[PDB]
Amino acid sequence: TPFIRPDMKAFLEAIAAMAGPTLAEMTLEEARASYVALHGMADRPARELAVIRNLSCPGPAGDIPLRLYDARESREAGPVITFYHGGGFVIGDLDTHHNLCTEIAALMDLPVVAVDYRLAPEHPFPAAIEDCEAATRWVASSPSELGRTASGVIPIGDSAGGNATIVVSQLLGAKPADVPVVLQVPIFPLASDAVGSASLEAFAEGFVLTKASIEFFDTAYKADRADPRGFPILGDHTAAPPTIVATASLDPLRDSGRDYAKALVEAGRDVVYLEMEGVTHSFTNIRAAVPSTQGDLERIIAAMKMMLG
């Protein structure tokens, strides 16, 4: 019934034919390893960049590892992209989204700093948020170790990282970092609770991200349902920064992103809503297996350039 691109359908069929186990059935290490293998299989290769460099910053439970990506060894002051990877706050790391980060850095000609935030179940909510916030504030202070000056920050992330993107914009909005959030890019984010949404039921199985996985992530992360830092649809939107909400039409979390973009319009904030038609959750990281998703990423990039001026 719902529209699906032919290249996207064949990837869904190949996944079904491979017939892997669920996140529940695997051990934590196996589930984390499976995510690495999926993106390593499915995404386009990393871009070659002048700078791919590990860093770290002070955090509230110790140092936070980071990775800086830049097409330029040396550059003028400008906005710095602060990136938070997807993975339910349970899986993913600096390597699962490495190639995507190099693509953003190459296409934007802006530096990208990815954050290796603490994961659940070892570190439940709000550990991930504390680290993403702290690393973003650190970048915003233009520390000597970053090697370039930030005139503003651009939070961006997929899924759980899209959740972190909005929470960070709201936390910096209430208590500003040294420079402002000049643009946020939540990509298929978890913003409102997906429980009860039509997209969750309609796309519960067979569309890369499953209802089973969502429930697995939620049990490990244990976010407070009433806390805007867990579900930022509940935050104060009246001073939200310029926003690009990107969703996928076949995503169980699609309606969550629709809700957030609508809440921004309701509050009179500038927002670009892009719903990629015929593709699933995780489309930013399957750009070789489903080649048309490269074009979806480039639409987000074009919107980001426009929204930066």
Residue 182's SS3 state is: coil
Judged by beta carbon distances under 5 to 8 A according to partner kind, the member of ligand D8F, ligand O=[O-], ligand 6NA, none in contact with residue 54 is: none
Q: Does 86 bind ligand D8F (CB under 6 A)?
A: yes
Instruction: Identify which of residues 23 and 154 has a Cβ nearer to ligand O=[O-] in the complex.
Output: 23
Eight-state DSSP code of residue 148: S
Q: Which two tokens stand for residue 212?
A: 């089973």
Taking the complex as a whole, how short is the minimal distance between the CB of residue 180 and ligand D8F, in angstroms? 26
Q: CB within 8 A of 167, min separation 6: which ones?
A: 129, 132, 133, 228, 229, 232, 235
Q: Return the active site residues.
A: 159, 251, 281
Pick the binder of ligand D8F from 4, 128, 160, 290 (CB under 6 A): 160
Residue 157's SS3 state is: strand
Judged by beta carbon distances under 5 to 8 A according to partner kind, the member of ligand 6NA, its own copies, ligand O=[O-], none in contact with residue 130 is: ligand 6NA
Q: Does 2 bind its own copies (CB under 8 A)?
A: no
- Helices in 63-154 by DSSP H: which ranges? 98-108, 127-140
Instruction: Identify which of residues 72 and 211 has a Cβ nearer to ligand O=[O-] in the complex.
Output: 211
Q: How many CB atoms lie within 10 A of CB 264?
A: 21
Site string for ligand D8F, 219-258 (x = CB under 6 A): ----------------------------------------
Judged by beta carbon distances under 5 to 8 A according to partner kind, the member of ligand O=[O-], its own copies, ligand 6NA, none in contact with residue 129 is: ligand 6NA
8 Å CB contact between 120 and 221? yes
Q: What gap in Å lies between CA 173 and CA 179, rounded to an integer?
A: 11
